[PDB]
Design a protein around this ligand. Sequence first.
Ligand SMILES: [Mg+2]
Length: 323
Amino acid sequence: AHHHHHHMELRELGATGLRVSPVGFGASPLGHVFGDVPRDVARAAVRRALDLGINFFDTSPYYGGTVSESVLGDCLRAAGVPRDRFVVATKCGRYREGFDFSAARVTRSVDESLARLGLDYVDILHCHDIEFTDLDQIVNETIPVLQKIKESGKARFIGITGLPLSIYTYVLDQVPPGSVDVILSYCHYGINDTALVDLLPYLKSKGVGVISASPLAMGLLTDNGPPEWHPAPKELKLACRAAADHCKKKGKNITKLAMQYSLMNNEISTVLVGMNSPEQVEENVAAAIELSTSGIDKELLHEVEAILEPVKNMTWSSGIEQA
Ligand SMILES: [Mg+2]
């Protein structure tokens, strides 16, 4: 006899032609609740992800965890992965010293990112956290500039990211069709908040691919709970603590349940997870394969959904007023 080897099933990303693993390797916010790791651990996490079939890596030039553009670049170089077998996204506009979405900064940004990544092009270049600028700048200036960067061949596809779902309608209503290829949304496709679903037809109709992130809502859907800085309302924090406790008391793990839940909508091509160590990679890939072969625990899910119902889709402010 032998054991059957199940693998993740790739998803098609928008109209890009890219086929991406349903679990993607993302960044972590500063001060995330796992804590940082040494560079050797970060490199081993990326290697483990490549070895388990993750083929989508998201990074940025801004603060995160130990996994950075330079770490990704070194790991990809060392692994020798064929370029058409993995997908890399980076971002521009958000830096440690502040936001700068101007034409000269982002044009320079891309070149810096490419050197760190050891690539001639990125698959995706996103405008990062655009709710922190006047969205008309993104419409009138930054997306035009990224068209030039795409035409240069240094980025194949252009994206926009941020927290409030209203940024995507504001921008995508006001740029020429085809100007944006993908979006990255976070915190809006997980058990406590699925509001991204309300944009999926819209995005499809505009030929925009969909990437989601933060399936555990930056630590809400964990046993440990969120970091002290987390801007969720206390009412949401309380409900997520009750949901985690509900799972724990029964010998189950909310993180696994939450990861699997976020994977249950195939109109989202990849769900990015901030992973810090090989073990976290192993756990998330197993959750995704188990979803595919054994199913989610539906009764536990229904119970957790009832706990979270009063706070479903509750969010928090981000960025400036659009005036
Ligand atoms: Mg404005």
